[PDB]
Amino acid sequence: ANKNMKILIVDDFSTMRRIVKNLLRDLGFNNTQEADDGLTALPMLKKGDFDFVVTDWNMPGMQGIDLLKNIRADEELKHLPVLMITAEAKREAIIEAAQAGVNGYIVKPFTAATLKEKLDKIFE
Ligand SMILES: [Mg+2]
């Protein structure tokens, strides 16, 4: 796992964006940027050459599931591994996210410990 991989953190609650960001900082990943909704994350991915996406699942403008779909329908972006953040792991929403092509999921609140298992798991 390369620690200079360009990571996009997507979440509508800015405090959550900065917590995810410091957890990634504690793990060797410092190349992080932010977006507050999928509508604002999309143009960032579209032009920014990112390597990894961490997105919230429920956002007001465009949802986590709809950004993953747009990423997956975009020829240029379809190779992007996506980790989803969710308030509780309901079986039904996860299966849906799995079917939509997400790489993994993590339930909040979470720690740097969990985050890394999730990252290792995704990258295999
Ligand atoms: Mg949210």
Author numbering: 5 to 128
Publication excerpt:
Vibrio cholerae contains multiple copies of chemotaxis response regulator (VcCheY1–VcCheY4) whose functions are elusive yet. Autophosphorylated CheA then donates phosphate to the response regulator CheY. Phosphorylated CheY interacts with the flagellar motor protein FliM and influence the direction of flagellar rotation from counter clock wise (CCW) to clock wise (CW). As expected, both VcCheY3 and VcCheY4 possess (β/α)5 fold typical of the response regulators.
To investigate whether the hydrogen bond between T90 and Q97 affects the hydrophobic packing of W61, M88 and V106, we have solved the structure of VcCheY3-Q97A. As expected, the overall structure of VcCheY3-Q97A is almost identical to that of VcCheY3 and the Mg2+ ion bound at the active site occupies the equivalent position to that of Mg2+ (or Ca2+) of VcCheY3. Interestingly, even in the absence of the hydrogen bond between T90 and Q97, the conformation and packing of W61, M88 and V106 are found to be unaltered with respect to the wild type VcCheY3. However, the water mediated hydrogen bond between W61 and E100 is not seen in this mutant. E100 is slightly reoriented here and has moved toward the CD1 atom of the adjacent I69. These observations, coupled with the quenching results, point to the fact that although the hydrophobic packing of W61, M88 and V106 is independent of the hydrogen bond between T90 and Q97 in free state, in the absence of the later interaction, reorientation of W61 and M88 occurs more smoothly upon phosphorylation. VcCheY3-Q97A and VcCheY3-Q97A/E100A, on the other hand, showed considerable quenching in the presence of acP, suggesting that in the absence of the hydrogen bond between T90 and Q97 (and also in absence of E100), conformational alteration of W61 may take place more easily and it can move toward the surface of the molecule. Km value, obtained by us, was the highest for VcCheY3 (6.4±0.45 mM) followed by VcCheY3-Q97A (2.3±0.4 mM) and VcCheY3-Q97A/E100A (2.0±0.2 mM) which are in accordance with our structural observations. The lower Km values of VcCheY3-Q97A and VcCheY3-Q97A/E100A are due to the loss of the coupling between T90 and Q97 which facilitates the movement of T90 toward the active site and stabilize the acyl phosphate. Furthermore, aforesaid biochemical data, in conjunction with the structure of VcCheY3-Q97A, indicated that the coupling of T90 and Q97 restricts the movement of T90 toward the active site reducing the stabilization of the bound phosphate and effectively promoting autodephosphorylation of VcCheY3.
